[PDB]
């Protein structure tokens, strides 16, 4: 669960090379396309009538950017993830009722998007570190247990 | 339910995979074991080092079986029926692991063929890996 | 894959359900809404009070559709095809909810027919509810 | 997430009427039967060759009793669930690698077993309280996040 020094290094290194708009737009689009039922939460985004439409939707892009910027907050303080997402947890879980399974799915989508963009640089060890990060965020977003 | 479009995409994917069955197979397993450690407990008699002969051999067999399902994509069941009882009844593999392996394969594909792995292809392959693993988890009860 | 034994068990279950389609249907929904609150957001135009007319009406429709799948258990798909697009494409129901509803129905059955709900019957009905909901989630992508 | 006074009352009331051996043996058996892959964790229980065999297995019974007694520990202090299961968490997650999904499944099996035994007394509101309890235990057993 706790991040090792190596994992911390993979996360920070890859993050430094990440274009939040590009990666985020691609991940949000793929989430909406690969797992279409998630579109039920983004009615206000307008045209989500097809892969290309979703991929070219400006609202998807802008929101995706905010999503990745948020993951960036996790990167800036890997040890304080629970706290960093407490409020977003109230938003996603308590208010929107987004089933936690979808957090994992977005996590899986992001991993695939990072892999496509970084190629062989995204080694198994690098993926392992990122998998711990997305899984930690997913967990911090789910219903808060005390 | 796989659509004609999905089957066409899956075949497009395998032509890319053909020629790299062992390489991709091994990496798929390597990412499975490194990212989801618990998965290693299913292979106690395997030397799980980076590129061990056992992992390369097994990785080849697994991806080769997937190739079979692509060839007989119209009826994956009968194509992988011989692996169904083995996994569910004899080995008693926890079904959650099939999702981890499918995800692992998708990562390997994204790494090696980003352009190929378009959202549309990603959808078809995900549906395919889901149907393939459904066949291997259909004999539990 | 439903076995002859499973189908026989499911029919045995429905003969118990017949005559209480509305009562059991309503309670199924009532347990869904009370135990998994998030589920209520899918029915904003419903008076979700204990035994409202809307819940009894809807509960009856849902269990009646399940009855249809039992009647055409050899081909559930074509039996509930008219509900597939409605749930996945038009309503965009999150697939996790089908498991919650299946579980809710099983609870209602355990409450009313404990002796009937043997482990063997529990297995068949779980496989059945899984196949039934697979039909309703098959049109997502 | 937090238990209301009503939920606390349903949990304590129903628990007072629970025969740990009877309920536990039935729940463990059903887990092994309804979700057979779980049998991979209980090789030492011997004969698990069929429903009746599993249902009549003495080791299943004895272990089931211990499982329910454990849920009893949650009942005795609903506010300290995370702490009460920390060690068992190390056992199930860290050591055995039991995927957390199985915890939910046992939770679902227990709810069904309680329903069969208590009939109409197991009202929707009572189930809701018990669902929060089993879900809380399941969560405390999964990988510990800090
Ligand atoms: C696949 C699961 C998820 C779904 C369905 C989902 C859904 C939503 C929705 C509906 C909103 C509000 C958008 C609008 O009304 O303004 C939102 C906000 C947001 N989400 Fe997610 N979300 C998911 C996962 C995540 C994850 C894992 C992150 C990463 C931290 C995240 C980060 C955010 C952020 C930062 C906001 C607020 C943005 C703003 O203020 O503009 N979400 N999400
Ligand atoms: C896409 C799904 C999978 C395919 C097509 C598949 C393929 C097969 C193949 C072809 C074999 C060798 C059979 C033979 O030579 O007798 C095999 C063996 C094995 N599989 Fe899988 N498999 C898959 C998923 C899994 C997963 C998810 C697990 C569990 C984590 C797993 C566990 C094993 C084990 C432990 C054996 C024996 C390995 C050894 O000791 O030789 N399989 N698989
Ligand atoms: C066992 C699976 C299910 C069956 C057989 C099924 C059955 C149907 C039936 C027959 C209708 C009415 C259709 C018609 O009159 O036009 C319906 C409507 C509806 N279903 Fe389901 N359903 C099931 C599960 C779900 C679940 C899990 C959800 C989501 C939480 C859901 C959401 C709805 C909604 C919102 C509608 C419209 C309700 C209203 O406004 O009238 N369904 N369902
Ligand atoms: C379905 C999920 C679960 C599986 C597969 C599982 C598996 C196991 C296994 C393999 C052990 C060790 C048995 C032996 O070697 O001695 C064990 C111990 C135990 N488990 Fe679970 N378990 C599950 C869920 C739970 C849950 C939800 C509880 C409730 C608190 C629980 C309570 C316990 C207790 C108290 C022990 C220790 C008993 C002893 O010392 O004798 N388990 N479990």
Q: Can you give the resolution of this entry in Å?
A: 2.2
What the block records as the tokens of D73 is 């520990």
Alpha-carbon distance of C102 to C128, in angstroms, equals: 9
Q: Residue B13, Cα to own-chain centre: how many angstroms?
A: 13
From the CA of D107, give the closest atom in ligand 4.
Answer: 27
What the block records as the tokens of C114 is 């404990």
Determine if residue D92 is labeled as part of a ligand binding site.
Answer: yes
Q: Is the CB of residue B43 less than 8 Å from the CB of residue B25?
A: no
A76: domain range? 1-146
Cβ of B141 and D34 within 8 Å?
Answer: yes
Distance B136 CA to ligand 2 centre (A): 10
**What are residue B75's phi and psi, to 5 degrees?**
-150, 70
DSSP code of residue A122: S
Minimum CA–CA partner of C96 in chain A: A99
- Pick the residue of A79, A90, A146 with the most D CBs within 10 A to test the interface with D by mutation: A146
Q: Which of A130, A129, A137 has its CA nearest to residue A103? A: A137
What is the CB neighbour count within 10 angstroms for residue D66? Answer: 12
Structural domain count of chain D = 1
Question: Which residue's alpha carbon is at the smallest distance from atom 32 of ligand 4?
Answer: D67
- Residues on chain D touching A139 (C-beta within 8 angstroms): 145
Question: Which residue's alpha carbon is at the smallest distance from atom 3 of ligand 2?
Answer: B62
Experimental method: X-ray
Cβ of C38 and A97 within 8 Å?
Answer: yes
What is the CB neighbour count within 10 angstroms for residue A39? Answer: 16
Distance D85 CA to ligand 4 centre (A): 11
What the block records as the tokens of B123 is 């959808």
Q: Is the CB of residue C31 less than 8 Å from the CB of residue C108?
A: yes
Alpha-carbon distance of D28 to D20, in angstroms, equals: 11
Per-domain residue ranges of chain B: 1-141
Task: Choose which residue among A87, A92, A99 to substitute to test ligand 1 binding: the one with the highest number of ligand atoms within 8 A of its C-beta.
Answer: A92
Domain C1-141 of CATH type 3.40.50.300: no
- Residues on chain D touching C112 (C-beta within 8 angstroms): 119
Pocket flag, ligand 1, residue A70 (CB < 6 Å)? yes
Pocket flag, ligand 4, residue D133 (CB < 6 Å)? no
Q: Is the CB of residue A42 less than 8 Å from the CB of residue A48?
A: yes
| Domain at A88, CATH number | 1.10.490.10
Alpha-carbon distance of D139 to D79, in angstroms, equals: 14
Minimum CA–CA partner of C106 in chain D: D112
- Exposed, middle or buried: residue B49 (CB in 10 Å: 0-12, 13-18, 19+)? exposed
Q: Which of D72, D53, D63 has its CA nearest to residue D25? A: D63
Alpha-carbon distance of D64 to D111, in angstroms, equals: 15
């Amino acid at each position: 669960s706790d991040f090792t020094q190596e994992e911390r290094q993979f996360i920070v290194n890859l993050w430094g090379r990440v274009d939040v708009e590009q990666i985020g737009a691609e991940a949000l689009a793929r989430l909406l396309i690969v797992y279409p039922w998630t579109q039920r939460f983004f009615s206000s985004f307008g045209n989500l009538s097809s892969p290309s439409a979703i991929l070219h939707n400006a609202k998807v892009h802008a929101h995706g950017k905010k999503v990745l910027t948020s993951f960036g907050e996790a990167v800036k303080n890997l040890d304080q993830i629970k706290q960093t997402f407490a409020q977003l947890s109230e938003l996603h879980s308590d208010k929107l009722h987004v089933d936690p399974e979808n957090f994992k799915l977005l996590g899986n989508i992001l991993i695939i998007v990072l892999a496509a963009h970084f190629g062989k640089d995204f080694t198994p060890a690098s993926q392992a570190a990122w998998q711990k990060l997305v899984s930690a965020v997913a967990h911090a977003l789910a219903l808060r247990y005390h | 339910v796989l659509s004609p479009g999905d089957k066409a995409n899956v075949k497009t994917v395998w032509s890319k995979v053909s020629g790299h069955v062992e390489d991709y197979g091994a990496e798929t397993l390597e990412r499975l074991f490194r990212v989801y450690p618990s998965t290693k407990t299913y292979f106690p008699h395997f030397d799980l080092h980076h590129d061990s002969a056992q992992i390369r051999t097994h990785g080849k067999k697994v991806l080769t079986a997937i190739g079979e399902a692509v060839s007989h994509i119209d009826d994956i069941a009968s194509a992988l029926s011989k692996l169904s009882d083995l996994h569910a009844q004899t080995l008693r593999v926890d079904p959650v692991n099939f999702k981890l392996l499918s995800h692992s394969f998708l990562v390997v594909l994204a790494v090696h063929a980003p352009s190929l792995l378009t959202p549309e292809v990603h959808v078809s392959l995900d549906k395919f890996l889901v149907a393939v693993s459904n066949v291997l988890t259909s004999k539990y009860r």
